[PDB]
Amino acid sequence: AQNPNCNIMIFHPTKEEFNDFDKYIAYMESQGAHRAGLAKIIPPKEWKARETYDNISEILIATPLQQVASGRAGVFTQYHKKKKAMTVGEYRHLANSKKYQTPPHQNFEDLERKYWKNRIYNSPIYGADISGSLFDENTKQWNLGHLGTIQDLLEKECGVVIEGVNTPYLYFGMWKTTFAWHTEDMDLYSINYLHLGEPKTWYVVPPEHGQRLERLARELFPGSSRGCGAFLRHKVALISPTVLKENGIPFNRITQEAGEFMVTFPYGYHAGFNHGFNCAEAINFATPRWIDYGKMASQCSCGEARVTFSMDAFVRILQPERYDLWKRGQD
Numbered sequence: 001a002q003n004p005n006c007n008i009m010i011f012h013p014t015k016e017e018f019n020d021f022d023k024y025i026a027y028m029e030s031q032g033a034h035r036a037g038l039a040k041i042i043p044p045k046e047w048k049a050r051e052t053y054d055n056i057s058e059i060l061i062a063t064p065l066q067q068v069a070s071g072r073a074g075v076f077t078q079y080h081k082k083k084k085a086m087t088v089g090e091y092r093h094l095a096n097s098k099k100y101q102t103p104p105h106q107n108f109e110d111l112e113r114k115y116w117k118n119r120i121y122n123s124p125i126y127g128a129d130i131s132g133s134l135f136d137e138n139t140k141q142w143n144l145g146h147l148g149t150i151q152d153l154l155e156k157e158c159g160v161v162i163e164g165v166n167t168p169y170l171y172f173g174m175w176k177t178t179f180a181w182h183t184e185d186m187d188l189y190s191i192n193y194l195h196l197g198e199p200k201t202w203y204v205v206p207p208e209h210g211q212r213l214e215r216l217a218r219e220l221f222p223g224s225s226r227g228c229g230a231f232l233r234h235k236v237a238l239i240s241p242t243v244l245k246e247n248g249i250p251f252n253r254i255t256q257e258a259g260e261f262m263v264t265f266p267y268g269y270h271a272g273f274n275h276g277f278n279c280a281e282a283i284n285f286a287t288p289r290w291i292d293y294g295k296m297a298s299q300c301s302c303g304e305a306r307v308t309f310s311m312d313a314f315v316r317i318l319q320p321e322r323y324d325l326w327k328r329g330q331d
């Protein structure tokens with residue numbers, strides 16, 4: 001078996017190998033990359049996502065989210081308070097303010113220490129899930145706005161034609177902005193490109209050990225666990241690496257820098273934080289190997305997790321028994 005310790009792999013494709021997305025994902029998996037839950041892909045040196053980022057300040061962040069923490073430094077939840085709309089220019093200015101900026105630090109490890117020590121005592125503002133793309137239409141390779149769609153994958157593999165579309169989303173982050181422990185909707189893959197700015201640190205549990213994370217999470221968030229059988233779909237729970245180590249949960253960590261791709265694999269739980277002002281673009285995608293994960297994915301039926309028009313069709317076709325009760329959560 002390739003990659004039996006489930007280490008995060010880093011790939012360096014040539015421009016020639018960067019021409020066929022599906023075939024490169026298949027290559028990565030041949031080398032065991034999926035076992036970790038997360039891989040990094042460094043694009044060829046000749047590739048660029050677009051010519052410059054000089055004209056992005058007028059993008060609107062219609063609902064910035066203030067991420068308010070509760071709990072203890074190692075084990076907390078965050079709630080997202082809606083703030084008034086601001087442009088990307090306004091947001092970058094706010095991110096760079098004395099109140100919100102990244103503190104002085106030695107290296108990524110000192111900054112990670114400061115994050116886990118101090119996160120709960122601040123409420124950074126996140127511009128998340130903004131439909132859109134920053135790829136130039138003339139970028140032909142690994143353009144997250146031109147991938148083949150999950151609907152077409154289901155059609156090619158399974159023969160069923162469904163409604164729905166699949167488009168990318170932009171994330172504008174600042175110091176301490178946080179993504180809680182989750183897998184993707186319907187345990188899909190995701191791909192994330194860091195377009196500009198400061199890094200993003202990721203933590204990931206191997207898919208083969210996801211249930212161990214869930215068991216710990218039920219113990220650490222006992223009331224949430226009673227209220228919903230898949231409460232990590234709410235995307236509010238944080239657990240530090242120290243706590244994961246104390247409880248024997250296998251995981252890995254890696255820092256993504258501007259100009260690099262990350263791929264998360266089906267049922268790879270991940271969490272992380274941003275080092276300072278940045279902009280990422282991400283989209284879900286599927287392969288043939290995904291199909292059985294889609295059939296087995298947990299679902300939120302307390303109704304908190306509340307998810308897309310397009311995810312309806314996936315649940316209807318892959319999880320017809322759940323469909324009924326699931327749609328009660330979403331209506």
Ligand SMILES: O=C(O)CNC(=O)C(=O)O
Nearest residue numbers: 171179190191192280282
């Ligand atoms: O970048 C973020 O804030 C979160 N991204 C993801 O969880 C992802 O790409 O799967």
Ligand SMILES: [Mg+2]
Nearest residue numbers: 055056058059
């Ligand atoms: Mg603009």
Ligand code: NI
Nearest residue numbers: 183184190264
């Ligand atoms: Ni994700």
Ligand SMILES: [Zn+2]
Nearest residue numbers: 228300302304
């Ligand atoms: Zn729920």
